[PDB]
Amino acid sequence: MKIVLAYSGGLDTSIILKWLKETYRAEVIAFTADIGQGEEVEEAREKALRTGASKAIALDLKEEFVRDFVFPMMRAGAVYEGYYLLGTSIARPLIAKHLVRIAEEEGAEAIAHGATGKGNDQVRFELTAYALKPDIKVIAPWREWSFQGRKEMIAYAEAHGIPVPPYSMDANLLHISYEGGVLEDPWAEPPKGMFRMTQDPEEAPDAPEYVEVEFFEGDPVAVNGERLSPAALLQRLNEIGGRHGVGRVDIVENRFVGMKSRGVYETPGGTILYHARRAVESLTLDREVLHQRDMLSPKYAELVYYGFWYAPEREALQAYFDHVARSVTGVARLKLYKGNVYVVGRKAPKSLYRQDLVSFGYDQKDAEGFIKIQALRLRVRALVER
Amino acid sequence: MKIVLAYSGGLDTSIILKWLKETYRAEVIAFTADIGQGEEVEEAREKALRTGASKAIALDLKEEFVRDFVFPMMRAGAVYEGYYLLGTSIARPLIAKHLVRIAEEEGAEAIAHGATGKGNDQVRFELTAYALKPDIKVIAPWREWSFQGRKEMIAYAEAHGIPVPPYSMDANLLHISYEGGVLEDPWAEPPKGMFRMTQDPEEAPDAPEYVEVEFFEGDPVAVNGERLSPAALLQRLNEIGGRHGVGRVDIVENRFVGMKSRGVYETPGGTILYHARRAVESLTLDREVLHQRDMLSPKYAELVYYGFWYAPEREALQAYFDHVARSVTGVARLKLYKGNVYVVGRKAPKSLYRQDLVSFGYDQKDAEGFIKIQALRLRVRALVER
Amino acid sequence: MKIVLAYSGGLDTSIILKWLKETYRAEVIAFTADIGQGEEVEEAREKALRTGASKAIALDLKEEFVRDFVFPMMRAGAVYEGYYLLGTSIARPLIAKHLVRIAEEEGAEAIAHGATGKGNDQVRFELTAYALKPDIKVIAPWREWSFQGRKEMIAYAEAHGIPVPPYSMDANLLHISYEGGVLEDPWAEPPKGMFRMTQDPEEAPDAPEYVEVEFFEGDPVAVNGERLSPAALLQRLNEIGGRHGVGRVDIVENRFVGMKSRGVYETPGGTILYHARRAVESLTLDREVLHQRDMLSPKYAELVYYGFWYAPEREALQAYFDHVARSVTGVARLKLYKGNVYVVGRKAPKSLYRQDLVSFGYDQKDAEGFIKIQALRLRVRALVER
Amino acid sequence: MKIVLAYSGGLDTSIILKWLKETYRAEVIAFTADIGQGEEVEEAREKALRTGASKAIALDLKEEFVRDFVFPMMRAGAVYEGYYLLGTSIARPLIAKHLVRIAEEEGAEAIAHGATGKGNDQVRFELTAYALKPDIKVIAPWREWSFQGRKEMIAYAEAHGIPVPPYSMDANLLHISYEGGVLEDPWAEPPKGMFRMTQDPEEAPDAPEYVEVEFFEGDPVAVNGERLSPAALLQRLNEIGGRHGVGRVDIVENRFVGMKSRGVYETPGGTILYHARRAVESLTLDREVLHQRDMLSPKYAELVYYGFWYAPEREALQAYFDHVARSVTGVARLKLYKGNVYVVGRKAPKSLYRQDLVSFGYDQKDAEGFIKIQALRLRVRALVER
Numbered sequence A, B, C, D: 001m002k003i004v005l006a007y008s009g010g011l012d013t014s015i016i017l018k019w020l021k022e023t024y025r026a027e028v029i030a031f032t033a034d035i036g037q038g039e040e041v042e043e044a045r046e047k048a049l050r051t052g053a054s055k056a057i058a059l060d061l062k063e064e065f066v067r068d069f070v071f072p073m074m075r076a077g078a079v080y081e082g083y084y085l086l087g088t089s090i091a092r093p094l095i096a097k098h099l100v101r102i103a104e105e106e107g108a109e110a111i112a113h114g115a116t117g118k119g120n121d122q123v124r125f126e127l128t129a130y131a132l133k134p135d136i137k138v139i140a141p142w143r144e145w146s147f148q149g150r151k152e153m154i155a156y157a158e159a160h161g162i163p164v165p166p167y168s169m170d171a172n173l174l175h176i177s178y179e180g181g182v183l184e185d186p187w188a189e190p191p192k193g194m195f196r197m198t199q200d201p202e203e204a205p206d207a208p209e210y211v212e213v214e215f216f217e218g219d220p221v222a223v224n225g226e227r228l229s230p231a232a233l234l235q236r237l238n239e240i241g242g243r244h245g246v247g248r249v250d251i252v253e254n255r256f257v258g259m260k261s262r263g264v265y266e267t268p269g270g271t272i273l274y275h276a277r278r279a280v281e282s283l284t285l286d287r288e289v290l291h292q293r294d295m296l297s298p299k300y301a302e303l304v305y306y307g308f309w310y311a312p313e314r315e316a317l318q319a320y321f322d323h324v325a326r327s328v329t330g331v332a333r334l335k336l337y338k339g340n341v342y343v344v345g346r347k348a349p350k351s352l353y354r355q356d357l358v359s360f361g362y363d364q365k366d367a368e369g370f371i372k373i374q375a376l377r378l379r380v381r382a383l384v385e386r
């Protein structure tokens, strides 16, 4: 039987490829997606073949990732529990999508992934798979094998000749996530030198740096006047924001499976894009549209976090967010300095701001009437209380 | 006829004090509240007497301000349009409340304030006034007078004996607001040296400073182990954060009155408290409670911003927020560095975090069933689309 | 100067026509719309010319009314304060839309309407007018003249040759509204004989009547197998629901301008449609989509009620509702009997219901896992309470 | 080993009692609760002993049911998916609460119930149990045993001495639920004579009946002037409403475990109470409070439906609803007639309604300013769209 494995190249997914051959005596098709992890995915592909894969596929999905997953999510202003910009979250749907497509192309029965039984990833992979191919068979080795502990897995690794070696990392174009190990104690600061995408604030330039991001109908299309594709644009902002230490988050979040866990994230480019968008929105979105939009963002955020990307409720909300984002066209000017992102300017060809309405269509006495009417129900209330 | 005026001691409320006397020929009781503007209010009380007030009152309302207004608001995680911590907004209700109490005490049928006809403050003072005493009369000189320029106001000031002297500011224990003049161009960065409460990040300490804030049942009670009263606590955090340049935001916001306005704010202490609270909340609040609470916060924020403090909607929402906030007990440890605030740790007596649930609360198979049930409707959907 | 008046042919708008001519020395162009009031609008168009209009326009807007206003609103499941199906609310935008178009075509700088200064209609008319043509001038005589009472208005009309003839009515294809007069006492049942669109349930047929309503992509397209245009369809359902006394509501509502008002409404066809729609949705909409949709309906309803039809917030929500409603294709079967409507059956081409899953893919063991995971956070909370 | 079983006295729970003793080599303590199912609970209690229970407990929980579960839910205006008044949903928590208490008193390590593995009840029972006593062991025979059909179940019972006897029913003081069998076809009207709690509208009195319900701080306290305890009050309204065939619902709902199912419900008393409460609320609740409250009700409804009664989200929302409900004091007057409930009058000690404001403080010109300000952002938008 054929099985398509989401293969990263790491120890665990390598142990999984061997485990699947041995346990299911199956023809394993390894799949590695280049989504900006900063690893030569071609090395993962050869290592998979070396580890026993009857086939290995490596694809550059950086553009699809940002264009079809990151951008739509950003248009919605999605933020989980106040700080998480969902770097790992929106990536999983993309990977499961291809796993399913590859399985259908290679006539494979099942697909497998290496997310553990304690997290959100397992849900994201599987909900995506079932939503796309309801008849698909899914295998989650972390839930199915008998290994108990790192020593056993390493022993098993060495036995099969698999290359063996504080926290665990998950990286892609949007961010790098860190959790586990020393990070499991919520009272303990992350260890110095852990971050990789972002330079330390204390080591960031002494001179602030200005950057401008242009948005067209809800999506960023240029940086400092240079038109850049979705992936190239995220990359560029990662470089600029990274040098300044921008986008570090440290939170204890609530997993979908029920328990809290301490996660640390660095999202330089995405963080710049979060504030740039709101800056352009401040001139281009209507007050009531904005207030409504912000009260829905958190719901869309948990949908992404839990793994309901290819789910009707998320696609429905997307219709709202996409409609609203269509008006977001303009430029945000931000000032980067030692870990912070400061909005310092913004402009738009169809700005709703009118200096003439605030400087010293507006008649001062209309305000009295507005106030009296707004006050009526409160006055009736007070009088009734006598 | 008696009129109680919200008197700050500035040129405008000074001009207003004279204007009221001439216009209404009423005795004016000047009221000056110390809410942390960093001004000697007795100086304003005496100047009010020199300007013609038949009675000048000055009260230290710092503790009432933080305890009965800033704290209840903070418990709700109130943030207007993404960044505004409502520094000016929660202050007006307090002032109006005293204006109405004093009018009742002095037998004054009317109150007056110096907010302009183009803004939010006018609504805040008046909705509060009418909500507390329905038949009170309110006079807003800015909406009633004839001055057609700043030049005319000063001439009137000099012609009357009032001392006369790029943007307008409003300061109190929570923040300092800056808007108008040079700030009316949303593409222009605020002028160098404008900020007064926070030190320029470029001139802030080279070594980060750690700070710990203790929360008890939703309100902050100690800083670095020192128990502090509400106003004392906010003051202490303003000093610590200010020294580091923390809490600066720049936005184009939507006034309740219809038009957009470019505002700049520095909220050092409040910004530290915002993040400290969420840090403690991450260990003490249930996932679902939190998610629901966060979707209501934006609504509570617009209520405070529009001026509906003493309104049934806000008091109802307050019951919800207060209920949830009651569990927020613990300590947040934050790191301050050149303009930025970083959560680096948190602990709590009744933390819901359990390392054993994440360390390598259910067994693997449980997750499989959870996923299958969660996936059911998506699979039926896919099948029907057959 | 020219003024386009929303003229219904009644006493008040006739008085208004005369009043406008003299007060503004203007040419008044009368506009009467047939939106299902059950009155020969041509008679109103002629009475206007007799009354002094320089031009009188009358249009059959029944189809545009149902297709472009009633249907989009019904797709959203809009219900104001638990019962009001907004019959008068969605009709005002339509009227004002034509007033502004006619004003433009005739070179008129202003439009006028006869809604009083204490209601919602004035807001709906003007918000629509201003939103479509920002510099249009609106004249609301009720807020400008000084008639001291009814007697005075009758004498004015008698003096102008206007024919002078216990509650006020507003009728159209969607419903008939009743309020004012004897209806002002919330404790008093409406008088017998008041209803006109519906038969007293006590006089309704002794046998129940079954009716089927087919929906296609969110809108009703057929009744009892007969395909019917929007307006013809609402009419047929009015006839059917009407004969049985269906659609009667009696509520005390909150007007946008601040005071409560007692209103009585009969919406036979719309009431059948409300339940028919939900019946088809019960087979075609996903659970999460439905739940989110229902939490937004109320907001949409107040938007309509207040008059924000041609408003970006409303249009944005409409994007969401339209997206969801595109899945609503199927047939609802209802049973009508003495005042009530009963859903007794429903079917759909792409129904999501599967008897497979309820009769004795699904494995009961999965339910245990689902339950354990959902319970984890509750159990942790319990252990911490200790 | 001791196991406390939710014992209804029926065939399946009797089979379960025998099954539990042998499978777990344990003694079973049967618990039967009278919650208004209209059965003699002492009969089930005696039968449990005859079936082998080591102890059988039967309690009258009618008052606790209505006072502590039904009323709190009603104050929230809870309605699931447009029509379900949650009759079975709110009863389960109460039952499980007692199972856990009895287990603790009897020193039993586990509890058991007879809900199936494909429904909602299992979740309600278990989430409740786990929330109250996290270490409790729950046994759900339907998800554990090996019976492969109804005939084998009958053979097992007949073999154990248990006596053996088109849809399934669940009845209590709030309603009677009907689902399964012939009701599984959503296009088929339910069978004649199926309803038990309500008289068919065709047979109901030709004379309408007026009923008055007095509310005090959110809860109903009297019917037609007669003060009644919670359970006696619900009983009374069931009798009155039942005679008139009030409260019948026919829906295809979404279960928490993922699939749709056709359910039929009769809730005579609860339906009168639903409309009675809203009638009193129309005079006692503020507009904004009401609108907010209605947007949260559906969320609370799904919580109850899913089984999250003793859950922090639900208790947090309850704080909101209870705050709001406290103003709900007054009397509702309804007209009952052949299946329908018509609100015909309402009054309250502190009614916020003022004939003052609608009859022909308020000055129409305030309305113009209100409208102008409300329209500003719309005019700005229009001008920009040019």
Ligand SMILES: Nc1ncnc2c1ncn2[C@@H]1O[C@H](COP(=O)(O)O)[C@@H](O)[C@H]1O
Pocket (backbone or CB within 6 Å): A005, A006, A007, A008, A012, A013, A031, A032, A033, A034, A035, A037, A095, A112, A113, A114, A115, A121, A168, A169, A170, A171
């Ligand atoms: N770039 C990728 N290509 C293919 N599969 C991936 C990729 N990144 C993650 N996965 C899968 O999802 C899991 C994610 O966990 P982790 O690598 O610890 O962050 C891995 O164990 C893989 O099975």
Ligand SMILES: Nc1ncnc2c1ncn2[C@@H]1O[C@H](COP(=O)(O)O)[C@@H](O)[C@H]1O
Pocket (backbone or CB within 6 Å): B005, B006, B007, B008, B012, B013, B031, B032, B033, B034, B035, B037, B095, B112, B113, B114, B115, B121, B168, B169, B170, B171
């Ligand atoms: N500390 C205070 N005491 C009394 N009235 C105040 C105080 N702060 C503000 N106000 C009132 O509210 C207005 C606020 O204006 P502004 O400072 O320009 O943003 C002043 O014109 C006063 O009438």
Ligand SMILES: Nc1ncnc2c1ncn2[C@@H]1O[C@H](COP(=O)(O)O)[C@@H](O)[C@H]1O
Pocket (backbone or CB within 6 Å): C005, C006, C007, C008, C012, C013, C031, C032, C033, C034, C035, C037, C095, C112, C113, C114, C115, C121, C168, C169, C170
């Ligand atoms: N069919 C119609 N055509 C034109 N204007 C109308 C029509 N129906 C109502 N109006 C306008 O809106 C107001 C509605 O008032 P009313 O009937 O008292 O509820 C009238 O005073 C008219 O100015």
Ligand SMILES: Nc1ncnc2c1ncn2[C@@H]1O[C@H](COP(=O)(O)O)[C@@H](O)[C@H]1O
Pocket (backbone or CB within 6 Å): D005, D006, D007, D008, D012, D013, D031, D032, D033, D034, D035, D037, D095, D112, D113, D114, D115, D116, D121, D168, D169, D170
């Ligand atoms: N009055 C009651 N006393 C004790 N247990 C009950 C009672 N009503 C329901 N239950 C439990 O919940 C299930 C309810 O029945 P059903 O509606 O047939 O799925 C039974 O299998 C019992 O274990």
Ligand SMILES: N/C(=N\CCC[C@H](N)C(=O)O)N[C@@H](CC(=O)O)C(=O)O
Pocket (backbone or CB within 6 Å): A086, A087, A088, A089, A114, A115, A116, A117, A118, A119, A120, A121, A122, A168, A170, A177, A179, A253, A255, A263
């Ligand atoms: N650490 C890791 N990746 C990423 C995550 C960031 C995060 N807290 C999230 O849920 O996105 N591996 C896990 C995370 C998880 O499922 O919670 C696993 O496979 O079990």
Ligand SMILES: N/C(=N\CCC[C@H](N)C(=O)O)N[C@@H](CC(=O)O)C(=O)O
Pocket (backbone or CB within 6 Å): B086, B087, B088, B089, B114, B115, B116, B117, B118, B119, B120, B121, B122, B168, B169, B170, B177, B179, B253, B255, B261, B263
């Ligand atoms: N500048 C000033 N104070 C403060 C406020 C910050 C802000 N944008 C807010 O609404 O709180 N004066 C005004 C503000 C206003 O009313 O919007 C006035 O009286 O008109």
Ligand SMILES: N/C(=N\CCC[C@H](N)C(=O)O)N[C@@H](CC(=O)O)C(=O)O
Pocket (backbone or CB within 6 Å): C086, C087, C088, C089, C114, C115, C116, C117, C118, C119, C120, C121, C122, C168, C169, C170, C177, C179, C253, C255, C261, C263
């Ligand atoms: N009675 C009338 N029409 C209709 C109304 C139904 C209702 N309560 C609504 O707001 O739609 N005329 C008024 C209503 C109002 O503006 O509230 C007026 O023009 O003054």
Ligand SMILES: N/C(=N\CCC[C@H](N)C(=O)O)N[C@@H](CC(=O)O)C(=O)O
Pocket (backbone or CB within 6 Å): D086, D087, D088, D089, D114, D115, D116, D117, D118, D119, D120, D121, D122, D168, D169, D170, D177, D179, D253, D255, D263
């Ligand atoms: N029919 C019955 N009881 C009640 C239900 C009304 C309903 N649709 C609801 O979920 O409350 N038995 C089931 C229902 C269920 O829990 O979904 C079972 O034990 O499996």
